[PDB]
Design a protein around this ligand. Structure first.
Ligand SMILES: *[C@@H]1O[C@H](CO)[C@@H](O[C@@H]2O[C@H](CO)[C@@H](O[C@@H]3O[C@H](CO[C@H]4O[C@H](CO)[C@@H](O)[C@H](O)[C@@H]4O[C@@H]4O[C@H](CO)[C@@H](O)[C@H](O)[C@H]4NC(C)=O)[C@@H](O)[C@H](O[C@H]4O[C@H](CO)[C@@H](O[C@@H]5O[C@H](CO)[C@@H](O[C@@H]6O[C@H](CO)[C@H](O)[C@H](O)[C@H]6O)[C@H](O)[C@H]5NC(C)=O)[C@H](O)[C@@H]4O[C@@H]4O[C@H](CO)[C@@H](O[C@@H]5O[C@H](CO)[C@H](O)[C@H](O)[C@H]5O)[C@H](O)[C@H]4NC(C)=O)[C@@H]3O)[C@H](O)[C@H]2NC(C)=O)[C@H](O)[C@H]1NC(C)=O
Ligand SMILES: *[C@@H]1O[C@H](CO)[C@@H](O[C@@H]2O[C@H](CO)[C@@H](O[C@@H]3O[C@H](CO[C@H]4O[C@H](CO)[C@@H](O[C@@H]5O[C@H](CO)[C@@H](O[C@@H]6O[C@H](CO)[C@H](O)[C@H](O)[C@H]6O)[C@H](O)[C@H]5NC(C)=O)[C@H](O)[C@@H]4O)[C@@H](O)[C@H](O[C@H]4O[C@H](CO)[C@@H](O[C@@H]5O[C@H](CO)[C@@H](O[C@@H]6O[C@H](CO)[C@H](O)[C@H](O)[C@H]6O)[C@H](O)[C@H]5NC(C)=O)[C@H](O)[C@@H]4O[C@@H]4O[C@H](CO)[C@@H](O)[C@H](O)[C@H]4NC(C)=O)[C@@H]3O)[C@H](O)[C@H]2NC(C)=O)[C@H](O)[C@H]1NC(C)=O
Ligand SMILES: *[C@@H]1O[C@H](CO)[C@@H](O[C@@H]2O[C@H](CO)[C@@H](O[C@@H]3O[C@H](CO[C@H]4O[C@H](CO)[C@@H](O)[C@H](O)[C@@H]4O)[C@@H](O)[C@H](O[C@H]4O[C@H](CO)[C@@H](O)[C@H](O)[C@@H]4O)[C@@H]3O)[C@H](O)[C@H]2NC(C)=O)[C@H](O)[C@H]1NC(C)=O
Ligand SMILES: *[C@@H]1O[C@H](CO)[C@@H](O[C@@H]2O[C@H](CO)[C@@H](O[C@@H]3O[C@H](CO)[C@@H](O)[C@H](O)[C@@H]3O)[C@H](O)[C@H]2NC(C)=O)[C@H](O)[C@H]1NC(C)=O
Ligand SMILES: *[C@@H]1O[C@H](CO)[C@@H](O[C@@H]2O[C@H](CO)[C@@H](O[C@@H]3O[C@H](CO)[C@@H](O)[C@H](O)[C@@H]3O)[C@H](O)[C@H]2NC(C)=O)[C@H](O)[C@H]1NC(C)=O
Ligand SMILES: *[C@@H]1O[C@H](CO)[C@@H](O[C@@H]2O[C@H](CO)[C@@H](O)[C@H](O)[C@H]2NC(C)=O)[C@H](O)[C@H]1NC(C)=O
Ligand SMILES: *[C@@H]1O[C@H](CO)[C@@H](O)[C@H](O)[C@H]1NC(C)=O
Ligand SMILES: [Cl-]
Ligand SMILES: [Zn+2]
Lengths: 597, 194
């Protein structure tokens, strides 16, 4: 009778067809990812086409229910989720061109190789060729060749495609009543209707910028420390008061400084905690790893893995005759079907990955009770933070000792804690300015604050000011260095990595207080605390039904993003950094360029 | 003096769909209820309005076994005073019942690879069901004021949707075969005993 009542019954029919199709399609994807055959590729695609065609029809039907007429929020939000046409807001030929450009820059990224003209037959592709050089090469010139020739050959072909992509995405976002395509991306965090828990797309920028200024002291001390270590290694290439050359940061873009550990380790004589050998000595297999992860989640008052998870998952590389995608994934096909695809080896790294992916399955099971649409993490940052806090607790030597993998003969040397925390800082603290600056640039590019004749001029103004990294070769407007990174040329929001990084430390900080943990936050293991498991579950069972502000508040007692716990995790490293940088210049000067002497 | 054909009901090769649930009348026979209860096979065996131990020590004029297939989650709806798509639109037990609900997992018999679509359930109905009322009409659900005209569309929905029953489904989305024992006593000769 009322529009609200009719939309409730439409959603019923929708939840029952979507659950079905999504299952069949997911099963086709499982079959291809576990058994890579030409027949399986064909069946995977036909399912993808059906699912797309289904959602197209359903979007047109959802459109027919005026949102204004609904008072019920969980129904109004579910209807809204469906109503977004996305691409079809543009003309047939304009949408065809957008899909064309999107396809092309994806293809150029995944298939663009760089040849050494000396041998025209031999060329290096980014994966594995170029990526290997950027993560393993110590030769200054080799790294510079790989950094520059990737941007010059591939990063220059992407430049005119990106310009058209920006203008088309903006026109699409304008039609969806967003100001720019960046505002559209920020729409994920937006919450309206719920008084006290509302969140605006503009607030996100204020909150990322305020939290970032609090990271600036630790990051400055980290950057200065790294610059000192790098300066010793390449003496005649780095300035004690300048930026760090982009080609000397451990990876193709310096996204994360984890590979710099080799050259920045504080205590080189002290060994590392790698229970790999202990697992091999105790005859552990892929099954014992997943059974140990299950024990972890059951100890926190969480459900045991379903009987179907044990029979249907592929937790080992399938021998030698059938090929399989070996990326560790957590599948949730619907209808109670939960699987993990992981080509598991008896290593500590795989053992920790079992906890991360099994945490995703735990989140999946918790919100599986919700209606189909609302079966997702609270915001784009949420699901990845959940899996990560498990691998945090599992990696603690305290945990390892209790599970028998770490010998009780292991004495906690505070030098190993500094080696550990620096390796952590290199990944986590180091990626925050990179992630911030990249999105800041992207948001302003859509905003219309940076013209095309300034795109690269500003990209390197921002890399020097915000990140404290300098380009080793002068890049003009024929280059497109942002696009030479996966997410930029593959149309993916990057801010998720900033938000989720701050979330995971908030989550751990809250669950560790619930676990009545005493001492350094980096040594916390939340095992056997069913109170911490209840605290976490309260949010996990919510899914996307309630605002992320309220979801977060259900765990940490706060409606907003917070740096305080991340800084708290790294406070012992920070005092050490503050001591080691006593005789060094902390901070950078933007005028120094490696190429300009 | 022959035994009631309970195996004919419980061991049927194919069961009915819940919306068009099947009813069998058991008559002129000696019913052994301990054979049914003492088995451990069934995932559920609940008797209402009468104790199962005192069933052998009683005569009725007739017995009715109502059989059908539903998901694991919905098994809690085949009980008096319960609500949801099944209790509301498919099979309704009176709020005050006198009989037994016997249910067991039939993932081995009723869920094929690729999905078994032979089992349907009613998703929409314009009125709640009365106890033991059966509805088999495939009339289009007119959700809106707009006349449907026998065609599926906006505010026009096919009331019957299928259980895609697949062997890899979780227990709550898996097939469960349900048999409901009704006891009848009229001013007429008692055909069933113990
Ligand atoms: C907006 O919109 C929206 C949409 O529409 C809405 O919402 C909605 O609402 C509704 C209401 O009703 C709901 O419904 C509900 O639900 C629930 C849940 O379910 C679920 O889960 C399960 C598991 O757990 C399963 O099985 C199922 O199936 C389901 O699933 C899913 O879910 C989801 C979510 O929910 C969805 O979405 C989906 O869809 C689904 N699926 C499908 C396929 O469908 C339920 O539960 C309910 O039911 C009812 O009935 C029953 C009987 O049958 C009962 O039961 C009970 O329970 C409990 C628990 O809980 C128990 O206890 C326990 O148990 C255990 C075992 O189990 C043990 O034994 C222990 O010891 C114990 O303790 C008990 O016992 C039982 N009982 C018996 C005798 O058995 C329940 O409870 C219920 O009841 C009732 O109902 C009513 C209604 O009918 C109510 O009343 C009223 O109403 C009105 C209206 O009409 C108003 O509302 C008022 O206020 C009220 O009051 C009551 O309350 C109840 N109760 C209680 C306590 O609560 C149902 O069905 C839905 O669902 C929803 N949705 C969502 C999404 O959520 C909203 O609301 C809007 N908004 C606003 C603001 O409004
Ligand atoms: C990797 O990858 C690769 C590639 O892919 C693989 O290889 C291969 O694969 C394939 C697949 O792809 C396979 O198969 C083939 O194919 C065909 C087709 O089918 C399928 O597909 C399609 C699409 O294309 C679909 O569609 C459709 O659907 C529909 C529905 O919707 C249907 O309908 C139906 O029909 C029926 C009849 O037929 C009825 O009527 C019903 O009612 C309806 O509904 C249709 O039909 C379709 N279409 C078509 C055209 O067909 C579908 O669905 C599907 O999916 C097929 O057919 C064939 O098959 C054959 O063979 C087999 C052997 O192997 C046999 O048997 C089987 O066995 C197994 C064991 O081994 C079993 O299992 C089991 O079972 C149980 C029960 O019994 C349970 O379930 C468990 O769980 C499980 O495990 C099963 O079952 C069986 N089956 C059945 C069905 O049951 C079959 O049967 C067949 O044959 C037959 O046989 C018999 C005796 O036995 C005789 O009697 C008959 O006559 C015959 N028939 C014929 C037709 O022939 C084909 O073959 C293949 O097989 C494969 N290979 C091998 C060596 O195996 C691989 O495998 C992978 N790998 C891994 C490791 O993964
Ligand atoms: C959101 O983005 C999607 C992207 O695809 C767009 O989806 C398609 O939208 C077009 C219209 O712009 C749909 O085209 C046609 O829809 C018809 C349905 O309505 C008919 O009947 C009513 C009376 O009941 C008439 O008033 C009306 O004028 C129409 O005659 C169908 O006849 C067709 O859809 C059929 O698609 C396939 C075959 O191609 C069949 O399998 C289906 O059963 C179905 O009947 C026709 O194509 C089109 O259906 C939508 N796509 C899909 C795949 O369904 C959305 O339009 C866009 N949002 C908005 C608001 O336009
Ligand atoms: C619930 O999840 C837990 C996983 O934490 C599972 O329960 C465990 O089942 C194993 C079965 O082998 C039990 O193992 C036993 O270990 C002892 C030594 O500790 C050994 O002497 C025994 O012979 C046996 O191998 C284990 O104790 C048990 N743990 C608990 C606390 O229950 C199980 O998979 C899940 N159960 C259900 C009902 O789903
Ligand atoms: C979480 O709780 C479980 C269960 O209480 C803890 O498991 C216990 O772990 C200890 C070893 O860390 C086991 O102790 C052993 O006892 C035997 C005999 O008593 C002894 O011979 C061994 O030398 C050893 O001391 C204990 O059996 C085991 N209990 C169970 C039921 O598994 C677990 O350690 C806790 N983990 C954390 C991180 O809090
Ligand atoms: C047909 O019905 C009879 C009786 O209901 C079932 O008998 C069972 O037989 C197995 C051994 O095959 C025993 O373990 C059970 O205890 C028996 N149950 C009862 C209630 O007597 C028989 O299995 C059924 N047949 C099929 C194929 O389902
Ligand atoms: C940390 O490590 C150094 C190693 O030389 C040691 O002297 C010191 O006592 C340790 N503890 C603290 C809290 O500084
Ligand atoms: Cl770059
Ligand atoms: Zn993950």
């Amino acid at each position: 009778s009322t529009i609200e009542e009719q939309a409730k019954t439409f959603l019923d029919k929708f939840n029952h067809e979507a659950e079905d199709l999504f299952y069949q399609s997911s099963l086709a994807s499982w079959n291809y990812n576990t058994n890579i055959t030409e027949e399986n590729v064909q069946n995977m695609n036909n399912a993808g086409d059906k699912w797309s065609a289904f959602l197209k029809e359903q979007s047109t039907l959802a459109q027919m229910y005026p949102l204004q007429e609904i008072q019920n929020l969980t129904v109004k939000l579910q209807l809204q989720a469906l109503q977004q046409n996305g691409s079809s807001v543009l003309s047939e030929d304009k949408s065809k061109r957008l899909n064309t450009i999107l396809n092309t820059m994806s293809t150029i990224y995944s298939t663009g190789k760089v040849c050494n003209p000396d041998n025209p037959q031999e060329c290096l592709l980014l994966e594995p060729g170029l990526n290997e050089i950027m993560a393993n090469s110590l030769d200054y010139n080799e790294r510079l060749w790989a950094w520059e020739s990737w941007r010059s050959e591939v990063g220059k072909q992407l430049r005119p495609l990106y310009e058209e992509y920006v203008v088309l995405k903006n026109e699409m976002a304008r039609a969806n009543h967003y100001e720019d395509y960046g505002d559209y991306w920020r729409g994920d965090y937006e919450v309206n209707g719920v008084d006290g828990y509302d969140y605006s797309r503009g607030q996100l920028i204020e909150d990322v910028e305020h939290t970032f200024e609090e990271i600036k002291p630790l990051y400055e001390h980290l950057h200065a420390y790294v610059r000192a270590k790098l300066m010793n290694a390449y003496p005649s290439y780095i300035s004690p008061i300048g930026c760090l050359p982009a080609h000397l940061l451990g990876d193709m873009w310096g996204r994360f400084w984890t590979n710099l550990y080799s050259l920045t380790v504080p205590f080189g004589q002290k060994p590392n905690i790698d229970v790999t050998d202990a697992m091999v000595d105790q005859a552990w297999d892929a099954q014992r790893i997943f059974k140990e992860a299950e024990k972890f989640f059951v100890s926190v008052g969480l459900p045991n893995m379903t009987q179907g998870f044990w029979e249907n998952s592929m937790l080992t590389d399938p021998g030698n005759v059938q090929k399989a995608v070996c990326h560790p994934t957590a599948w949730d096909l619907g209808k109670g079907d939960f699987r993990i695809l992981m080509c598991t080896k008896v290593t500590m790294d795989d053992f920790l990955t079992a906890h991360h992916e099994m945490g995703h399955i735990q989140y999946d099971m918790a919100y599986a009770a919700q209606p189909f649409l609302l079966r997702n993490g609270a915001n784009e940052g949420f699901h990845e933070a959940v899996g990560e806090i498990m691998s945090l607790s599992a990696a603690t030597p305290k945990h390892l000792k209790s599970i028998g993998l770490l010998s009780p003969d292991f004495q906690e040397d505070n030098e190993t804690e500094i080696n550990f925390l620096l390796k952590q800082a290199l990944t986590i603290v180091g990626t925050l300015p990179f992630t911030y600056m990249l999105e800041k640039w992207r948001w302003m590019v859509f905003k219309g604050e940076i013209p095309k004749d300034q795109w690269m001029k500003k990209w390197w103004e921002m890399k020097r000011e915000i990140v404290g990294v300098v380009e080793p070769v002068p890049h003009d407007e024929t280059y497109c260095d942002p696009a030479s990174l996966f997410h930029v040329s593959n149309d993916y929001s990057f801010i998720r990595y900033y938000t989720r990084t701050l979330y995971q430390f908030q989550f751990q900080e809250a669950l560790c207080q619930a676990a009545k943990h005493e001492g350094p936050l980096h040594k916390c293991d939340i095992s056997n605390s069913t109170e911490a498991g209840q605290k976490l579950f309260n949010m996990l069972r919510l899914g996307k039904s309630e605002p992320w502000t309220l979801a977060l508040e259900n765990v940490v007692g706060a409606k907003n993003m917070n740096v305080r716990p991340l800084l708290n995790y790294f406070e012992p490293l920070f005092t050490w950094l503050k001591d080691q940088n006593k005789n060094s210049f902390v901070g950078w000067s933007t005028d120094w360029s490696p190429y300009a002497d | 003096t022959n035994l009631c054909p309970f195996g004919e009901v419980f061991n049927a090769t194919r069961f009915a769909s819940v919306y068009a649930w099947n009813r069998k009348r058991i008559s002129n026979c000696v019913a052994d209820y301990s054979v049914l209860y003492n088995s451990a096979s069934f995932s559920t065996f609940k008797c209402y309005g009468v104790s199962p131990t005192k069933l052998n020590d009683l005569c009725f004029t007739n017995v009715y076994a109502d059989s059908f297939v539903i998901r694991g989650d919905e098994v809690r709806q085949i009980a008096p005073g319960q609500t949801g798509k099944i209790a509301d639109y498919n099979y309704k037990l009176p709020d005050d019942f006198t009989g037994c609900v016997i249910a067991w997992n039939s993932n081995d018999l009723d869920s094929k690879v690729g999905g078994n679509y032979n089992y349907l359930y009613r998703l929409f109905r314009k009125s709640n069901l009365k106890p033991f009322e059966r509805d088999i009409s495939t009339e289009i659900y007119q959700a809106g004021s707009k006349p449907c005209n026998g065609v599926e569309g906006f505010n026009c929905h096919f009331p019957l949707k299928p259980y895609g029953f697949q062997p890899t489904y979780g227990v709550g989305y898996q097939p469960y075969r349900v048999v409901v024992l009704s006891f009848e006593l009229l001013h007429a000769p008692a055909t069933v005993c113990g």
